[PDB]
Amino acid sequence: ASLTVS
Amino acid sequence: ASLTVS
Amino acid sequence: ASLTVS
Amino acid sequence: ASLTVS
Amino acid sequence: ASLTVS
Amino acid sequence: ASLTVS
Amino acid sequence: ASLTVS
């Protein structure tokens, strides 16, 4: 699972 | 901007 | 899922 | 401007 | 919703 | 520095 | 959510 922020 | 969780 | 703001 | 949640 | 950069 | 989104 | 770099 992933948490992506940009 | 984008925050993604999955 | 996503939160997008721009 | 746009806020999206899905 | 809020996007902050600083 | 910070990028905050919520 | 928060991304910090310092």
Next chain:
Amino acid sequence: ASLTVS
């Protein structure tokens, strides 16, 4: 130095 994401 630090990279913090949450």
